[PDB]
């Protein structure tokens, strides 16, 4: 009889998506990524900083 927004109503959210619980519990919205130390090539740096 009444449409409820899953983006506001947490019960409807869980009803439509059982994975919302795991997402919230493990904080997949704030996943800290693994680091890399790759550096751009000197030709790339010169082209970026050239006219």
């Amino acid at each position: 009889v009444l449409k409820k927004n899953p983006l506001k109503n947490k019960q409807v959210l869980l009803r439509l998506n059982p994975y919302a619980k795991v997402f919230a519990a493990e904080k997949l919205g704030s996943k800290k990524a693994e680091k890399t130390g790759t550096k751009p090539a000197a030709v790339f740096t010169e082209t970026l900083k050239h006219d």
Partner: protein, 57 residues
């Protein structure tokens, strides 16, 4: 069905029509492909010898 154009492109200064040659060829080709099937059924730009070049007005 034929072509009309003085030596402006009327379909239906004349030559024979070729407006269904592709359709006929595709009909025959799809028949042959069906017989064949029934019998047995982001690029990358690198810079080694090219560099970006500053060419502006």
């Amino acid at each position: 069905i034929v072509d009309i154009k003085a030596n402006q492109g009327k379909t239906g200064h004349i030559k024979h029509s070729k407006c269904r040659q592709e359709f006929l060829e595709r009909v025959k080709a799809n028949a042959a492909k069906r017989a064949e099937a029934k019998a047995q059924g982001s690029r990358i730009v690198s810079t080694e010898g090219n560099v970006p070049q500053t060419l502006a007005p």
